[PDB]
Design a protein around this ligand. Structure first.
Ligand SMILES: COc1cc2c(cc1OC)[C@H](CCCc1c[nH]c3ccccc13)N(C=O)CC2
Ligand SMILES: COc1cc2c(cc1OC)[C@H](CCCc1c[nH]c3ccccc13)N(C=O)CC2
Ligand SMILES: [Mg+2]
Ligand SMILES: [Mg+2]
Ligand SMILES: [Zn+2]
Ligand SMILES: [Zn+2]
Lengths: 320, 325
């Protein structure tokens, strides 16, 4: 238990040893990382959240991530939380999202994949699942993650927002919904188009964002970047994330095959190239996103972008 | 002979101003079932889509049961009214041969399910009271998402899948169209929906047959969305004896919601305070700011097909206005 404390001192750094923390914490990475970030940002006193209510909620939330899902589990949630925490500190901003906006982005990251079944929205839609029937084929999983994340606040001693004012709770709820809904992959291109627009019309002294519409757009893109941050991490971490997403994909492709459905991209294990898929994912999705981002906050996050380009070069070299 | 009178009244199914409250009584509180069945036969939809008649009746009766008989406005009579109004709007000369049988089926089915299981309170009330529905749907088109989920879920009950003989592509296309239509009945979408309809009227293209030219999904679904939205907001365009009954019913629902808001210490929603209400001024305002802007634009789209409907709306506005001084 003291090596865990040592691991947590790198909470403000890109490349935290999140898999080690998951092992040392007894598969409680989301709980410990969240507890550490709330202390570090002084959110428990800022919003008057009792420490025991925080722990109770975090453990209940963590329990609703599936332990038999290789990628979309509590370790991924903890990673996205911690990554958002670092991006919130990019100098190109500095103290410029409200404290409520900071709490919303961090809470949204923690709940953003809760109760994920390990299959895609398209799978849930094409299989006529109960989830897709409930949500009318529209951001099916993301709507569900939000509903679960908020519903768990109503469990015994779980309301970490009990001492927020009524206005604050309403504002936070809207921001959290806006952020998590933006993690739907089908919204990526519009999100990226808007982020580009913002960069081109950027005003700085540091970024000056006067209207809520632009600020929520940045927070949406921020958590999206954090969700798509695996290829920007030290390679030892990135390779583990690749192993886990491919396990999840292959298990879904097997289900598509058996049902006679078209197999989803990268999900056919008999015609799969893991490394080519990573290079293509970086080239078409992750690098455009992170380059645009790095432009927005230029020239901060050059170290993050440096790692992404190193990792792209390495994966390409593994292709004969 | 009760059935004979009912059959006589259903001969008016192609007319604006159908005696829908009489049909509700004569059918034993089954206006949605009998009006939908009549329209499906009139449009030959059972034959076209190979819908077994017993399956249709079973689904309709189950759907109708899931409207709340104890809500004054958002009940099965309102659903039957919106269905029949959509059916008349679909028959307008300016749209002859414009929509496929599948699009027609989608618009009518959407109208039938569009308020199912409505609790008689607004989306904002459900959001502000932290309801289970608003929690499920993240404060976004809360009721309309629920109406869709219930309407589709009921197709899975015993002998209720009226779409059992559609192709897979037909079912996929119908499902998407129905979702797009019912979500457009959310009041928060009205201003953008109307702005788009105005843009279409200003840029409208007509064929050599004289009918509307709609050559992409965006334009086709937009017309169907606004059509069902007009049907939903059609009460002030109906003969006055119908309109006044709809006004009585919505005010009962509004006042009951206001009584709940008042008891909870909430600010009372507009038109919901029975101690500070003007029913007549509220109807004139509703017409002037919402219903007439919408219907004048629809009438422009299908000109001159809807002139009589617009004339009735304007007469009814003048009538309510005349009761204020
Ligand atoms: C470590 O490598 C991976 C990690 C993850 C993914 C893919 C990876 O490698 C190809 C997929 C991407 C699939 C397509 C997709 C999902 N969201 C998107 C947003 C924008 C564009 C595409 C997508 N994820 C899906 O949940 C996120 C996690
Ligand atoms: C007979 O009179 C009425 C009938 C109905 C309404 C209001 C009436 O009289 C004021 C309300 C309107 C409230 C606010 C509202 C709801 N949707 C809208 C769409 C656009 C603009 C406002 C609204 N309805 C709500 O379900 C439809 C039924
Ligand atoms: Mg997700
Ligand atoms: Mg409705
Ligand atoms: Zn995620
Ligand atoms: Zn309605």
């Amino acid at each position: 238990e003291d090596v865990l404390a040592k691991e947590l001192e790198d909470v403000n750094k890109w490349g935290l040893h999140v898999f080690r923390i998951a092992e040392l914490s007894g598969n409680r990475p989301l709980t410990v990382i969240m507890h550490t970030i709330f202390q570090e940002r002084d959110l428990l006193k800022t919003f008057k959240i009792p420490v025991d209510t925080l722990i109770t909620y975090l453990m209940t939330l963590e329990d609703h991530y599936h332990a038999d899902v290789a990628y979309h589990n509590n370790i991924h949630a903890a990673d996205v939380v911690q990554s958002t925490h670092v991006l919130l500190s990019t100098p190109a901003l500095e103290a410029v999202f409200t404290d409520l906006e900071i709490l919303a982005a961090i809470f949204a990251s923690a709940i953003h994949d809760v109760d994920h079944p390990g299959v895609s929205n398209q799978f849930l839609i094409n299989t006529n699942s109960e989830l897709a029937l409930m949500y009318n084929d529209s951001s099916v999983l993301e709507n569900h993650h939000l509903a679960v994340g908020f519903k768990l606040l109503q469990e015994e001693n779980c309301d970490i927002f009990q001492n927020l004012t009524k206005k604050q709770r309403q504002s936070l709820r809207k921001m959290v919904i806006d952020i998590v809904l933006a993690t739907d992959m089908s919204k990526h291109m519009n999100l990226l188009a808007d982020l580009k627009t913002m960069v081109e019309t950027k005003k700085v002294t540091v970024l000056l964002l006067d209207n809520y519409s632009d600020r929520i757009q940045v927070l949406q893109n921020m958590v999206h970047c954090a969700d798509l941050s695996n290829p920007t991490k030290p390679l030892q971490l990135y390779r583990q994330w690749t192993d886990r997403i491919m396990e999840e994909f292959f298990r879904q492709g097997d289900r598509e095959r058996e049902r006679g459905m078209e197999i989803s991209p990268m999900c056919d294990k008999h015609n799969a190239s893991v490394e080519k898929s990573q290079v293509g994912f970086i080239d078409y999705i992750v690098h455009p996103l992170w380059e645009t981002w790095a432009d927005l906050v230029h020239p901060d996050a050059q170290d993050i972008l440096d790692t992404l380009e190193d990792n792209r070069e390495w994966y390409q070299s593994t292709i004969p």
